[PDB]
From a paper:
The sodium/proton exchanger NHA2, also known as SLC9B2, is important for insulin secretion, renal blood pressure regulation, and electrolyte retention. Na+/H+ exchangers are physiological homodimers, and structural studies have shown that each protomer is made up of a dimer (scaffold) domain and a core (ion translocation) domain. Na+/H+ exchangers operate by an “elevator” alternating access mechanism, wherein ions are transported by the core domain against the dimerization domain, which remains fixed due to oligomerization.
Subsequently, human NHA2-Fab in nanodiscs was prepared, but with the addition of phloretin to a final concentration of 1 mM prior to grid preparation and subsequent cryo-EM studies. The resulting cryo-EM maps of the NHA2-Fab complex with phloretin reached an estimated resolution of 2.9 Å (FSC = 0.143 criterion). Additional map density for phloretin was observed in the extracellular-facing cavity, located between the core and dimer domains. Interestingly, the sidechain of the strictly conserved ion binding aspartate D279 was repositioned by the presence of the 2,4,6,-trihydroxyphenol moiety of phloretin and was observed within hydrogen bonding distance to the C4-hydroxyl group. The second polar interaction was to the main chain amine of G361. Moreover, conserved hydrophobic residues, L181 in TM3 (scaffold domain) and I283 in TM6 (core domain), both interact with phloretin, and these residues are important for gating an ion-bound state. The phloretin pose was modelled based on the strongest map density, but the presence of an additional non-modelled density highlights the flexibility of phloretin binding at the rather open and solvent exposed binding position. Both cariporide and phloretin are fairly non-specific inhibitors and yet seem to have a similar mode of inhibition, by wedging themselves between the core and dimer domains and thus restricting Na+ binding and/or transport.
Residue numbers in the entry:
A (entry chain F), E (entry chain D): 1 to 134, 144 to 191, 197 to 221
B (entry chain B), D (entry chain A): 79 to 521
C (entry chain E), F (entry chain C): 1 to 196
Write the structure that this text describes.
């Protein structure tokens, strides 16, 4: 089997630099081209550049010429990309794909999983639950820096009406809202923000 | 007590392991799986073992298979077997440098082995042999590429010129063996072949550069043609000066004459080749080496035998490296059966036309039928210059980031590797087989 | 450059029909028009290299027709798996350019959003913030309008909007609108009226 | 036509320039001012030129000055002249590796040059000569360091042991010259000196390590003493096995016997030295090399002459490198006149006591007065081990970040460099002068 | 003569990195130790570490271990210090001095000139002049990121009472105040902020 | 560690007298007590290595006495050049530690600060900010107290203070106090009273 695995999600501050890692197993590493693709949320993909892990030659999209730096190491069979002077426009998912350079109909045909890069200034924060009452109910988790809040509801609520809207940036303050549907007696959302380890429950009552 | 085959094998295994161990102790990380020196050592040993093994097999009337096939196969298997390839990695700089050194050694050996009187006689014949078959094969191969592979004309001629020059690395050792044996010496066939096989490279590379510039519309053709002419001129001038120098100065009355002469010729040849390559005139180095060695041998006369012996030992050492590296260049990725049949067809037809052209070029030269046939079958070997410039077109197309040009460069690379594999072994075997028979021994 | 354009960014399709995706380039790429598929979880896999050369392991449904500078991709019949975003790429020239992408959405009967209001709890007043939430849910299609009518007063500012991807069980949509204002603005209004 | 001195000088200049040019062409940036290989080449040439120039001068009854002084001065001037030093930079790894290779070469040469019967006779005398003068000089030098320089006792003994072992690099070539001439062969003086001059290094380094550990209160003394004993034991065992191996297996009936034997001995010696250093037992490599070469020579008997010749050529090549590097280690910063007078006094008094002790050790051995005097004056040379471990104490003190210990280590380094400069040239000159006179020639 | 010259003042953003340079002339570069000293304003000096430009060995104060990285290049005869993950506490003047390692009474005895590094977040700003009237007169230049505003006064004011108080950080908002002493008729301070090239005058009148 | 302490951080000295600087270590450094001088422009030069070993090129006035763990540095006579900050260093142990430093200040007759108030101009009100400035100047010594009495009301917050180094022509001192407050706080007060 062929698989490319890259580093996990990253958090950076404006003006800093980040090292992306993309390691591939299941094929001769030095036999293929490694291509990098940046997908900003909402927008479509857009090519960055490639590295030949045989002679270490590279080619870059004119847009990213200078912004990125591609490197590879044969022994570790991994490839890295450097993003320098990160700004607000350099926060997006980054893919790595291989491409057979010596095939007349070459393509990518093997991609990574995506390594989210966030360039913000704020630091970690504890989510705050704001229970809401008038059917349906929602707690409207407030701001928190680390994205993976992973809001949850105790067993029974997940039966239906479990719409969990995606967390919005909201001026460097993530806002994830949830709602449930049903009588008056209800449950509360078990916010499990792991970054701050604040397993807030904040039971909501039928006021 | 120790004796016989077992003692010899024990000693050889010990020497091999000890050489690796010494290198590892001195360097440490280089001579371990993955490091450069480990790769070089393993490639060297594998090439030698393959040469010996292939030499062993001799069932039919045909002589034992050439060791060239063994060395090429060793390099190929090192490159293509997955895990072996992962472990054995040689830096490109080192590979190119070693191949250049081997080329310089063989050019010096050829230049020393030339015969002045034969060269004085076979004057026009050498020029015809060197410049006719290359041009005709380039043209016919371009025709075939355009019609079969579908390349345009410029790429057809790029391919034709890549699939051009004969390899001195294959021709020279065999002709030197035959000359030592005394075959064809009366008419100077070995001299003709050794001299002609070192000039056509300049023409092939000049045509390749010109057609590449035309294809990518870079620079100008006049510049590249003038570059070729200047290569010839400066190579001849530098070689003449150096040859007249070393022909006199290490005098007959010095303590270590043979050692000093050997060092001078070999070092001057290496310096010429490398500096010319680095100064943008690849092709002046080889010609300068040939002319320098020729003049030095002419001056030394009998004394050159010891220098020849030492250089022959050096070549025995360096041939496995050269051919193993050439084989390691080949990758099975480019030999995909997508269109390999058509590439094989073009290579074969081009080779047949080259044989016919070579026979016609030496027609009016005083040779008889057997000598002409041997010469035609001795002009086949192709290597050490198809591997050097096989992938240049593909790299240029990749730099320009054009898909079609990448496809064309890939076809060119496939044809180059094909030609190498097909023609080097068969060519060496044919030279060895047809030498004693067709040529007229002198005793 | 060779900026590519996909005519339709979101086209509905049933679970038993044939759909077509149109990709048009700003130049003449001979045939170098790879296709790609990205699933909602974020995994992207190749589909069709060189216009119509079906890739290995791809189901036979995908047919990469099209030629010239107006390429297209066709789906024989649509399965629940084939609901994703499809990109058309080009490697004819140096800078490879992807298309805008297209999202396949399952057809269904039209729906009406719930559009329920949500008054911020007393915790909001005591905490310091003041956010009003409109929760319109289960609407179809994505054509919705967001506006708040707090105490009749109308503002075009301080609104946070979030959408939900296509629903996998009933194929509906969810909209959440959150309005954050100063506590003083809260104090002068007590009646909630939200329009959608 | 060319002839005479002018032709020779033209050829030599050409060879030098051509060697540099070839290396530069192959490597490029390494062989340019600042790069490593340029530094190595320049140091090599400067050492050779200095050796020759110093050899030229012979005004008085004393023979021509030893080339050792010339090579050391060449290295010293390269290190200390500002701009020359800036341009000529040699990586530490390369310098250490080259010095290790030179040491291995000389140890192999000494081991081959030993005489079995003489060693069988002068059995106790060798042990006394090897282990007595070193200990007595270490003790007296520690006394002098404590009283004059003011070092404590532990540092006094560290200094005494650094200023310990005699240098085989200086003793062995001269004793081999004398043995070839036939001087003192009847009583086996050259054998005694060559054998004894390769064991005292182990004792000196063991004492140095023990006293260093005591001074910095690291590890334990028992561990370091046991390390020394294990060094001796494993060196002897490995050398015996390797010697009995190469003494038999490259058989008398092989095609390139001399070449294979030479490669085996040299490679095994290099491997032993480097691996032992890398495995934390520096001192087992030298003993293993000595014992292996001794056993191999004993097995080969007459056939060893060609191996000796080849190794002698190798040593001729490598001696300039070794001594130039040793000289380049010396820095005038450590030779400040702040206290150089006292360091000179301690070195001189220690040397006098060493001479007296060496004379007393060989008193009851059957030698006559002249032979004892020559032996005492032939035990002076100190080098290639004072430069190796001269600055280790200073580095350790710097690592511990103690000012007083840094001062002590600086005194130790000054004394080491002093001892080298003072004793190597005078020692070599005295060996050469007193060899023919005191020793009894055999014809 | 011997002299060490180092890079000029550096502006950096939190979490970034800065490369200090110290080039020395007039002596054998590889013959001496290069020591780095950090002087935070108000606080005393603080030894950082040293680099031997002969074998490129180093020793670091445990406080600055990992935070700093020393390198040197013999051919350029220059030494560099790498400060990683700069914070608010890494803004101070940095010196480089040589030290003879082989002298029993060694010291530094030859220092650089000082390379201020500022770790802040705000960007360039234009100074704003606020003339002040009731003797004395001052304009109290307001915030500006680049420190060297170089406030000036037209000829005549410099006679006396020209006290120009040093600029203060003021919550990443530089405030440089000036005053003059004297009748009612006065002059205007000629602020010459070169970074923004805003040669504002804003004459003050006797209100 | 061997943290060093300089007893006096700022000691006055005339232009024709002998001054002494005291440095005391938290351990027993044998004699490794280098001294350093830093001038106000920021250039620092070595003075005395190893307690009393006067450096080369240093004027003979500097005498580095002291021994044990209580070291000292003495100046024969004080010149206008010798007005700077003097640090005592130690290299006895691994982490070299400098002292706190000492600043030499020229003696002079005592002075009284001008302590003049400065009302923010109308530009301040219109711009949005509100800063009140107290300008007390030409005082001696540095012993001063900063406080504002705007309309009698007293706050201990929102004060920016800046000092001037020793004056080179009259050896006096300058203090600037700037108070930044909300415009509303400005609106309720119109009388300025500053205390120093
Ligand atoms: C009498 C024969 C005269 C010809 C002599 C030619 C050989 C010259 C020796 C060069 C020594 C290379 C040093 C190692 C490189 C290094 O430091 O390494 C420095 C770099 C390689 O490292 P990087 O790639 O990381 O920069 O050198 C190079 O760029 C080139 C590689 C070295 C050249 C390879 C060939 C050397 C082996 C020579 C075999 C002998 C041939 C001659 C016999 C007839
Ligand atoms: C028959 C004799 C047997 C003994 C053979 C010993 C020599 C072995 C040859 C080693 C080749 C070194 C390759 C270059 C290093 C490299 O790539 O470079 C890699 C590194 C150096 O580069 P870095 O310092 O940047 O890592 O190698 C080292 O760390 C060590 C330096 C190389 C060793 C120096 C000595 C080599 C010259 C040998 C002379 C011949 C001696 C034998 C004659 C009797
Ligand atoms: O090996 C090569 C090719 C080197 C080369 C030249 C130009 C180029 O563009 C790429 C490679 C070569 C020559 O050049 C000349 C020769 O007489 C022989 C020979 O074997
Ligand atoms: O050169 C050295 C010193 C090497 C070394 C050993 C230990 C150490 O700590 C530092 C250096 C040396 C030996 O070791 C042993 C020998 O027979 C000869 C010899 O010349």
């Amino acid at each position: 089997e062929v698989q490319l695995q890259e580093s996990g999600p990253e958090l950076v501050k404006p003006g800093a630099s980040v090292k992306m890692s993309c390691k591939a197993s299941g094929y001769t590493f030095t036999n293929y081209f490694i291509h990098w693709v940046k997908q900003k949320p909402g927008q479509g993909l857009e090519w960055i550049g490639y590295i030949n892990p045989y002679n270490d030659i590279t080619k870059f999209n004119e847009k990213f010429k200078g912004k990125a730096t591609l490197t590879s190491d044969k022994s570790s069979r991994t490839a890295y990309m450097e993003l320098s002077s990160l700004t607000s426009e350099d926060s997006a998912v980054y893919y790595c794909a291989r491409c057979d350079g010596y095939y007349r109909y070459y393509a990518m045909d093997y991609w990574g999983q995506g390594t989210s890069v966030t360039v913000s200034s704020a630091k970690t924060t504890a989510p705050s639950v704001y229970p809401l009452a008038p059917v349906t109910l929602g707690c409207l988790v407030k701001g928190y820096f680390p994205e993976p809040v992973t809001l949850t509801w105790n067993s029974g609520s997940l039966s239906s009406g479990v719409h969990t809207f995606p967390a919005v940036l909201q001026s460097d303050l993530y806002t994830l809202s949830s709602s449930v549907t049903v009588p008056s007696q209800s449950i509360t959302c078990n916010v499990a923000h792991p970054a701050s380890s604040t397993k807030v429950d904040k039971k909501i009552e039928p006021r | 007590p120790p004796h016989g085959l077992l003692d010899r094998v024990i000693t050889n295994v010990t020497i091999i392991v000890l050489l690796w161990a010494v290198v590892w102790s001195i360097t440490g990380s280089e001579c371990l799986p993955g490091g450069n020196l480990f790769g070089i050592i393993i490639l060297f040993y594998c090439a030698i073992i393959g040469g010996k093994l292939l030499g062993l097999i001799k069932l039919p009337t045909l002589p034992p298979l050439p060791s060239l096939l063994g060395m090429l196969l060793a390099g190929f298997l090192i490159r293509n077997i997955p895990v072996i390839n992962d472990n054995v990695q040689i830096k490109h700089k080192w590979s190119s440098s070693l191949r250049s050194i081997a080329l310089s050694i063989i050019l010096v050996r050829a230049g020393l082995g030339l015969d002045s009187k034969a060269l004085k006689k076979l004057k026009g014949v050498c020029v015809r042999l060197s410049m006719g078959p290359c041009i005709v094969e380039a043209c016919t191969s371009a025709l075939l590429a355009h019609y079969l592979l579908g390349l345009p004309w410029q790429w057809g001629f790029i391919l034709g010129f890549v699939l051009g020059a004969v390899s001195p690395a294959v021709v020279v050792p065999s002709m030197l063996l035959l000359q030592g044996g005394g075959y064809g010496v009366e008419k100077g066939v070995p001299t003709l072949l050794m001299a002609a096989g070192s000039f056509d490279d300049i023409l092939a590379i000049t045509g390749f550069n010109t057609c590449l510039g035309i294809a990518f519309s870079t620079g100008s053709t006049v510049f590249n043609v003038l570059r070729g002419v200047l290569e010839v001129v400066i190579g001849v001038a530098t070689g003449s000066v150096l040859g007249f120098f070393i022909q006199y100065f290490p005098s007959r009355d010095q303590d270590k004459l043979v050692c000093k002469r050997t060092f001078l010729v070999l070092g001057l040849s290496v310096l010429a080749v490398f500096s010319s390559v680095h100064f943008g005139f690849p092709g002046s180095g080889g010609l300068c080496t040939l002319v320098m060695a020729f003049l030095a041998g002419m001056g030394w006369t009998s004394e050159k035998a010891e220098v020849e012996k030492i250089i022959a030992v050096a070549w025995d050492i360096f041939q496995p490296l050269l051919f193993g590296l050439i084989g390691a260049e080949v990758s099975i990725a480019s030999l995909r059966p997508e269109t390999v049949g058509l590439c094989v067809a073009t290579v074969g037809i081009a080779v047949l036309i080259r044989i016919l052209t070579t026979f016609l070029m030496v027609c009016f030269a005083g040779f008889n039928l057997k000598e002409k046939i041997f010469i035609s079958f001795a002009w086949l070997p192709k290597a050490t210059v198809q591997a050097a410039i096989g992938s240049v077109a593909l790299d240029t197309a990749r730099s320009h980031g054009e898909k079609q040009l990448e496809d064309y460069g890939m076809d060119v690379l496939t044809v180059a590797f094909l030609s190498i594999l097909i023609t080097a072994p068969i060519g060496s075997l044919l030279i060895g087989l047809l030498g004693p028979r067709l040529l007229q021994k002198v005793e | 450059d060779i900026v590519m354009t996909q005519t339709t960014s979101s086209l509905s399709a049933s679970l038993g029909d044939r759909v077509t995706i149109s990709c048009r380039a700003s130049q003449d790429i001979s045939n170098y028009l790879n296709w790609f598929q990205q699933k909602p979880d974020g995994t992207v896999k190749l589909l069709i290299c060189y216009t119509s050369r079906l890739h290995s392991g791809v189901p036979s449904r995908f047919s990469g027709s099209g030629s010239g500078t107006d390429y297209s991709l066709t789906i024989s019949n649509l399965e629940q798996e084939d609901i994703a975003t499809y990109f058309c790429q080009q490697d004819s020239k140096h800078p490879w350019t992807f298309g805008g992408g297209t999202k396949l959405e399952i057809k269904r009967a039209d729906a009406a959003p719930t559009v329920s209001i949500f008054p911020p709890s007393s915790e909001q007043l005591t905490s310091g913030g003041a956010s009003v939430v409109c929760f319109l849910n289960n609407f179809y299609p994505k054509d919705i309008n967001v506006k708040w009518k707090i105490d009749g007063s109308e503002r075009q500012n301080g609104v946070l909007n979030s959408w939900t991807d296509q629903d996998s069980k009933d194929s509906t949509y969810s909209m959440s609108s959150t309005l954050t204002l100063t506590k003083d603005e809260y104090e002068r209004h007590n009646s909630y009226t939200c329009e959608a």
